[PDB]
Amino acid sequence: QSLAERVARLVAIDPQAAAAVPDKAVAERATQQGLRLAQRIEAFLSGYGDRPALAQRAFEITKDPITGRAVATLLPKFETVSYRELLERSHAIASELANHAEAPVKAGEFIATIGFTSTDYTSLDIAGVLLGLTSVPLQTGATTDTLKAIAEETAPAVFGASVEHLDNAVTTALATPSVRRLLVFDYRQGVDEDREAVEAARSRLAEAGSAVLVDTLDEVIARGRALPRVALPPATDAGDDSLSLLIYTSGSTGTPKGAMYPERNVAQFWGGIWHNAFDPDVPDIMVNFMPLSHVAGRIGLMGTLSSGGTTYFIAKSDLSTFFEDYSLARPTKLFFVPRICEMIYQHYQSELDRIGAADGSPQAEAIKTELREKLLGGRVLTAGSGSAPMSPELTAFIESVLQVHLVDGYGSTEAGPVWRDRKLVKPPVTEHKLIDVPELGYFSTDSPYPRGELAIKTQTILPGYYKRPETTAEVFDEDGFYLTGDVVAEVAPEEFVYVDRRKNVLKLSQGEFVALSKLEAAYGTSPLVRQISVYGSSQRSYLLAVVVPTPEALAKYGDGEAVKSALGDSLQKIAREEGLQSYEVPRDFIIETDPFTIENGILSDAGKTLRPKVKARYGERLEALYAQLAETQAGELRSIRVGERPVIETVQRAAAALLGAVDPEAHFSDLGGDSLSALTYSNFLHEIFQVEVPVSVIVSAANNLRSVAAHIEKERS
Ligand SMILES: Nc1ncnc2c1ncn2[C@@H]1O[C@H](COP(=O)(O)O)[C@@H](O)[C@H]1O
Ligand code: NA
DSSP states (O other): OOHHHHHHHHHHHOHHHHTTOOOHHHHHHHTOTTOOHHHHHHHHHHHTTTSEEEEEEEEEEEEOTTTOOEEEEEEEEEEEEEHHHHHHHHHHHHHHHHTOSSOOOOTTOEEEEEOOSOHHHHHHHHHHHHHTOEEEEEOTTOOHHHHHHHHHHHOOSEEEEEGGGHHHHHHHHHTOTTOOEEEEESOOTTOHHHHHHHHHHHHHHHHTTOOOEEEEHHHHHHHHHTSOOOOSSOOOSSGGGSEEEEEEEOTTTSSOEEEEEEHHHHTTTTTSGGGGGTOOOOOOEEEEOSOTTSHHHHHHHHHHHTTTOEEEEOSSTTOTTHHHHHHHHOOSEEEEOHHHHHHHHHHHHHHHHHTTOOTTOHHHHHHHHHIIIIISOSOOOEEEEESSOOOHHHHHHHHHHHOSOEEEEEEETTTEEEEETTEEOTTTEEEEEEEOBGGGTBOTTOSSSOEEEEEEEETTOOSOBTTOHHHHHHTBOTTSOEEEEEEEEEEETTEEEEEEESSSEEEOTTSOEEEHHHHHHHHTTSTTEEEEEEEOOTTSSSOEEEEEEOHHHHHHHOSSHHHHHHHHHHHHHHHHHHTOOGGGSOOEEEEOOSOOOTTTTSBOTTSOBOHHHHHHHHHHHHHHHHHHHHHHTTHHHHHHSOTTSOHHHHHHHHHHHHTOOOOTTOOTTTTOOOHHHHHHHHHHHHHHHOSOOOHHHHHSTTOOHHHHHHHHHHHHO
16 A cells, blocks of 8 residues: 555565565665765675666577678667676776776866766766766757867867767767867667767768767777776765756757756766655666756766666667556656656557457446557556646546556756655755846736746756856846746645646756747747747647738638648758758647737737737637647548558548648658657557557658558558
8 A cells, every 4th residue: 555565565575575675784885975986886796796777678699681780679678787687887986987098088077978877878877977078968959060069168178979860970070170070979889870870980080080989889899898997086076066967958948048057966866865856775777768968867877876677778769669668667757747647648548449448347347458568567556757747637537547646846947856756855945035027027026826937056056167257147036046037836835736837948848948938939930920930838749830921821821720830841841951850740730820019919019929829819729739739630530441542641630639730742750759759659550450550760861751651551561
């Protein structure tokens, strides 16, 4: 019943879980007062000895008989790396980098890295801490213009990259004269495609006459194993105050700014105060799907290392192996972002259909049982979400599936953890207040509950944004409070509810900020667009916009669904051109034929669109668009019940229902879902056509919707 009883019962009957329980003595040695980060990390990892620390899906290599090329294919199991092995491989990397013949790194230099999350990436991250470097994890979805800007600002000496991202890593490195070495990780020896991507990087660097040196991570470790360990602690300038990490975020300004993490703040991920974001000693077996560059990726991964647990890494970056991985790893602790919860709920609606059951009926309850017991692996003891708000209906559903309480954890890159199930986390938060936002209509005198921007003093507050004292100042008031940008309602002494943002950047259900004003500037260059105001709700997974089209567009296409299609195609292409993410493409529009103007109240005296006025005039209609699609996605029930139409038409119509917007020639990617949309599409078509419809056939750039139909037809034969 209670958590402690549930834990005691799992450890009595499960040998794998029994072997993973935290050891109080290891945490006591590692977190002792005054101990430097590097040594803390060393004490956790050496302390947990031969336990399995990390697990990667196993694969096999076989010679393709048509092409001759050695290809890798996933196996239905995981292989593990021990705490001892992890520590030893990380030390090897530090030893090799400190001792390189020509470009030895020193403490305080920067290392930039682009990868997903993996055993290798984790090695490299730890090695940076051992050397006293400052790490700069870069977002795998950023454009090379953004990567170059961050690299120009931080001047890294070493750049690391997974094989998947190597080509963007070469482009950045060529524009960044400080880079002396390029390290290539997640490299599979004997796999032809990996070997070729490294050869092509070397050619590009050759052709440029670059002095940059390329090494695989394997080779670096091989070399380092033969060298003595570096001395801890490393020779940095400021002890605990030494700059260990930069987490780039766009929340406070709309473009990336480098949140400074000294070693004393990074230490909080390793068994420190971030324990309490979510909150009896539980064995920690976790599946990690979050990039290391996202503070949530680091919280999970280092939390599990620091508790002597095991992290199972999601097998593919697209997340297409999601259920397979959870069904194999069978975690005891779940952390979701709300988008994952939406996806599980969409699966549950799918299963209701397939067995033709309804509502809360007994066979509908059997679907929840198989989610909890089989698909999610049946050992979930605790669960949390965060990064974005969750509807009460989605929370109710997830909890009825898992049969455990779903903790809501609020915090940020800048502040650390701030609340747990409404209640301020003290420590580290020491004081708070609310600040009125009269332009949006929120005031501490509101009834029934005060509303305002949350402002806090907290022990885990960042010292600044790197090299950006102006941007730093904007987030601190004259009394020393950090300004979160988040509007909240207060419902009891020191209890809060997320309501809105003070400005023009917000989270969607994926947990990533979207900068409304940047998207507006990009989308405003469409020849069809006169004015555009982009709108989002943080409980949704996609955006909307209010568009005033040009007279020529309104004349050529009219003011209904066909101009919305025209606009979609135009925006989609801009998004492809400027490297925007799939979810930052508006899915549906309010077409306004009457322009925004000063007379209207929509434009200020200075000509600029006022967001609060857009909201006051179009907010209801925008919220209706969202509501109606969420109500209507049983249009799939009618797409399934046919059979009576050709393959392509079902393929089309299916893509249309899942991505809000069609045309036979489009690519599913262009159309603006996200990688979990293609998983859902894939199961849907598999159900109907009893054919395997893999995500890689659906997402690969050279495959449009006609290739998808074509694939299904060929498989059927
Ligand atoms: N549990 C939550 N509920 C609502 N919004 C959240 C929650 N957790 C994080 N956020 C939002 O995500 C931002 C932090 O983003 P990051 O800096 O990526 O951790 C916050 O300022 C909020 O806007
Ligand atoms: Na998001």
